Amino acid sequence: TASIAQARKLVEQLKMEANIDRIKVSKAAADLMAYCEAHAKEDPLLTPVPASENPFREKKF
Amino acid sequence: SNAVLTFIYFVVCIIGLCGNTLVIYVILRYAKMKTITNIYILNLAIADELFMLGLPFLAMQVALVHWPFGKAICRVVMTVDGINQFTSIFCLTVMSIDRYLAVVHPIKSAKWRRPRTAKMITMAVWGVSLLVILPIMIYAGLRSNQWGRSSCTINWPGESGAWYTGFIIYTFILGFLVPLTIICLCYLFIIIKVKSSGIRVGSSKRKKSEKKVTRMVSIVVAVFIFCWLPFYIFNVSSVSMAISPTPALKGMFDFVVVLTYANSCANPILYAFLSDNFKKS
Amino acid sequence: GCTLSAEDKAAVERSKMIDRNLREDGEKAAREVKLLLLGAGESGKNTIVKQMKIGIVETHFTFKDLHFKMFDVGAQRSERKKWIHCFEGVTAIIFCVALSDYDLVLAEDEEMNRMHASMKLFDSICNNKWFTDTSIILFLNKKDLFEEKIKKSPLTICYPEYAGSNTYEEAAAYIQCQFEDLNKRKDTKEIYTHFTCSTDTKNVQFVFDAVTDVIIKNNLKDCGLF
Amino acid sequence: GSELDQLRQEAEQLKNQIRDARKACADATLSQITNNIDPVGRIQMRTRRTLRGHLAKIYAMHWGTDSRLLVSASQDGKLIIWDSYTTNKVHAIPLRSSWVMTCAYAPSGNYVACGGLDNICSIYNLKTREGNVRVSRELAGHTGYLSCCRFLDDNQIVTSSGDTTCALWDIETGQQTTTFTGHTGDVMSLSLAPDTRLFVSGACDASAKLWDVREGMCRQTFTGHESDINAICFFPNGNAFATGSDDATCRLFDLRADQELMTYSHDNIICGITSVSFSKSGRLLLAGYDDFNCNVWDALKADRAGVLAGHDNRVSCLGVTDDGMAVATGSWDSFLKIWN
Amino acid sequence: VQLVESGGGLVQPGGSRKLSCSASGFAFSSFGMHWVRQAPEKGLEWVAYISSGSGTIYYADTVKGRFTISRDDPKNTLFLQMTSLRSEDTAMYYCVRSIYYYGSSPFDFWGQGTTLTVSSSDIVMTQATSSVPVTPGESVSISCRSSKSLLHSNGNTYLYWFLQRPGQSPQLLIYRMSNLASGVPDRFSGSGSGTAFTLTISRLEAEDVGVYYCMQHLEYPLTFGAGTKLEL
Ligand SMILES: N#Cc1cccc(-c2ccc3ncc(-c4cc(F)cc(F)c4)c(N4CCC(N)CC4)c3c2)c1O
């Protein structure tokens, strides 16, 4: 009669997590792809940049 | 026979070059000063590599005995051969002393030697090698022979009958006699320390560990003696009793020279390959 | 190189001094002996302030010009797998046990025994993917309790397949053989066994001898003669 | 007994309700929608900077806000601050306890945090009139070893511990203001949202819980793994996160829709993942392994766009700057590399 | 933090003394030290500099080969030794504290200083204005110019602004002509481009009266600037 409190708390927790809003997976995937596309221009790792604006270029010494 | 001797020269040169280059490349590319042992091994390999370059020049002395290179080339090759010889011997002695200090006196002496004294010891070894090889040997110069072809040989100074004996006994003392005592004492004391450590605390495998170390000591000392002994005895015997120059004498002298050069290519096959480098390579 | 200003040269000097301080501090830390101490609990781990002394608990002491650092990790009460790799480079793991209380079959679980668990722990520790090439030194117990407990109760027969009985030498040798025949390497790892006595000095000389033997073996394996 | 059994039955009924409410929305999969896009080229990066000076294993590192300074923690009891443009050393902070497992760097640049295996989180002050670095205060109260810490603000910090609990702290006073409980196993990592209003944490029970900083109440729980979770990080959008486990698998999760998205696995690799990090544009996902090598994955096609091999020991930590210019890698061979 | 100088007094041309300086309240052995000449009713002048750990010592060509600067770390004292003293050695000697790393602020604490009266290519030192009659409640703009561009390819301009008030030592105002020093009011601001520089004070009050100086740290022969005295 000691774990009843923990069981009731867990049941109350699992009874609350179901009262939330959801969306469709396709819409989320499309939004994620849209973000990746729209921020793809200025990613230095995706697009190699010339040595003029690179501060990490290896020098002679 | 003579062509066979030249072919033996070439094959031992190729073997020494390939092995020493492989060891140096592996150490530099992978280890990068992991331990002072690798530092000493690199020091030994650098000296052994430079041996193999000199011998092809010695081939011209062996076959087609006439020397068209001149005086500068012969003096340079003699100087580099002597410097490399003495630095290799001194590196072997220093390695033996380092092992003895590491094992027998670990609590006290190993503390001081470990950090950076190795570079100073290397500089001192090279310096003493130069100081011992240059002032006495650079007297060499081309000497006319009864064959009629210029040959590379140490020039005889005045009162050479005693000077040559003094030179040979001095180089026998410094080159052969001193290193043997150091190596034997250090390795025997290492054996005694291992046995005492085994007996002091109950160890089941104490019998197994002792067996390998003695075998390695025997292999090292035996190969060193077998490579370096015939030359000095040949010299002292030829000086003691006069003997006429014969084709057999020249062939056996060549054999003695190649046998003495053999120690070089033997060194990295033994020291580096049989150590904890086996898993690394 | 020469293109630096006056500020960057002083910055480089500062960095060089930091490097030299780091190197000289790290040189001294390489000549310390690290010991990892494990035990079943009340098996004698707390007996340190008397035997060798005049979160993770750490104690420092010296003996015959040698620095020691003992780490007590028995109070962590956490999953061992997630942090056991932090002691990959230690020297001479110490496994303190107390098996003189064998016939007293208790587990605090009503089903098991101290001896069996202790061997489970010993086998678990000794055969990790780490801790290979790491020697183990064993401390057994104070023998007087075993003396006075085997005479009155011939309960040693509770161990299956045992022939002798009520002989301290035979039982102690049998237990030592039982532990020393548990390691699965038997070729690259060594085990040292000792019996603790009331004397204060006798419990430190053994540790000093064991650690110096381990150091000598490591030097032999490192210098290529092995 | 009977009450316990009926409570368990009610819990299983709620679990079934969650299971069959999640499954109604899983209409399509990401790969079949993303197949229209053109794959990224084979990314090849070179080593530009090699940082040396540590004498033991490297366990953690963190990038500064200016993306030029970084702090790294190692097991030799030292804490070094680097200048990544010239390889110079700015600071070296000795520690009271040698064993550390994590480190953090304040967003303003005034404080550095460290801790691990001693159940104490320490705070260091870098800008003093005295001319040295001194510890400001030590945080105590946890029971298990510390596994991660992140500076929420200049006066707040959130930590995760091996006692299965995460706690928020008030640096000025030194008392826990909020405690988060519910993980069955050990908590190993956490990551803060860009708005500092939510955070996640991965635990040894193969589950990750989305917490809430303000009210201190758990919101969502994600499953799908089969072993320990060792790394976690947010997508730059703030609506997704990727987890790395010890089953040689990386997975991507979505917050708005409670469903699995992607799996990053290959039959050629069967080793565990140590660190996970994202990129500035969110296109390529980086993950370090214990097979001595790193790997660069395309976040949209689950394909190896390249490799990153420069270490001879296990890779333990990863980091990407705020401007996306470079990436840093730390390993157990006591060497730090900067790749571009 | 405190910095007290010792060894002053009155000297003769055939005389020699050993100045002293004691530092308390901070880590002395991790800082660079300077000496700055300041003649009565004249401007400032750099003299000498010793690095941290005694790794580097620089002098001025005007007193090269004539002064010796040493460091005493465990006892936290600094010394300057003089051999021969000309008539032009009368000044108001100061000890300056500076530390160099990425993002630091050198010349932050100027010390109290002491007095010593003696009985009777390089960058140019130039400023346009010499005095300005000002009334509180408005803005003041001060200009300083050099003969060479102070800008490096990395992007740092080494121009230092600081103020001296009567009866007390000078204190740092702006370092690297972009940043305000710690504890300095936000009323002050600095800017420039290449060779042209300016210093603007948004609001003026009775505590902002004194003499202003400009210094460059481009090369080790440190040259100060003229004074722009503001009178209430
Ligand atoms: N140290 C020393 C040292 C100690 C004692 C005697 C000598 C000594 C004296 C006279 C020599 N005369 C000719 C040659 C020679 C030259 C060649 F091109 C080819 C060749 F087959 C032989 C020698 N060589 C070169 C140096 C060594 N390899 C040994 C053989 C000579 C060595 C020493 O050099």
Numbering used by the authors:
A (entry chain C): 6 to 66
B (entry chain E): 42 to 322
C (entry chain A): 2 to 55, 183 to 354
D (entry chain B): 1 to 340
E (entry chain S): 2 to 121, 136 to 247
Tell me what the authors wrote about this structure, in their words.
The small molecule paltusotine is a highly selective agonist of SSTR2 relative to other SSTR subtypes. The cryo-EM structure of the SSTR2-Gi complex bound to paltusotine showed that paltusotine occupies the bottom of the orthosteric binding pocket (OBP). Notably, paltusotine largely resembles the core region of octreotide, with an aminopiperidin moiety and an aromatic ring of hydroxybenzonitrile mimicking Lys5 and (D)-Trp4, respectively, and makes extensive contacts with the major pocket of the OBP. In particular, the amide group of aminopiperidin forms a similar salt bridge with D1223.32 or hydrogen bond with Y3027.43 as that in the structure of the octreotide-bound receptor, whereas the hydroxybenzonitrile group of paltusotine is projected into a hydrophobic cavity that can accommodate the side chain of tryptophan from octreotide. The additional amine group makes a hydrogen bond with Q1263.36. A notable feature of paltusotine binding is that the large 3,5-difluorophenyl moiety is placed toward the extracellular end of TM2, creating a minor pocket formed by L992.60, Q1022.63, and V1032.64 in SSTR2. Paltusotine lacks the extended region of octreotide, resulting in the loss of extensive contacts with the extracellular ends of TM5, TM6, ECL3, and TM7. Specifically, F2947.35 slightly moves towards the difluorophenyl group of paltusotine, shortening the distance between T19445.51 in ECL2 and F2947.35 in TM7 by ~1.3 Å relative to the residue pair in octreotide-bound structure. Compared with the amide group in the octreotide-bound receptor structure, the amide group of aminopiperidin in paltusotine is far away from Q1263.36 but still retains direct contact with D1223.32 and Y3027.43, altering the polar network important for receptor activation transition. Adjacent to the network, replacements of L962.57 and L992.60 in the minor pocket occur upon paltusotine binding, which subsequently drives the downstream benzene ring of F922.53 to flip down.
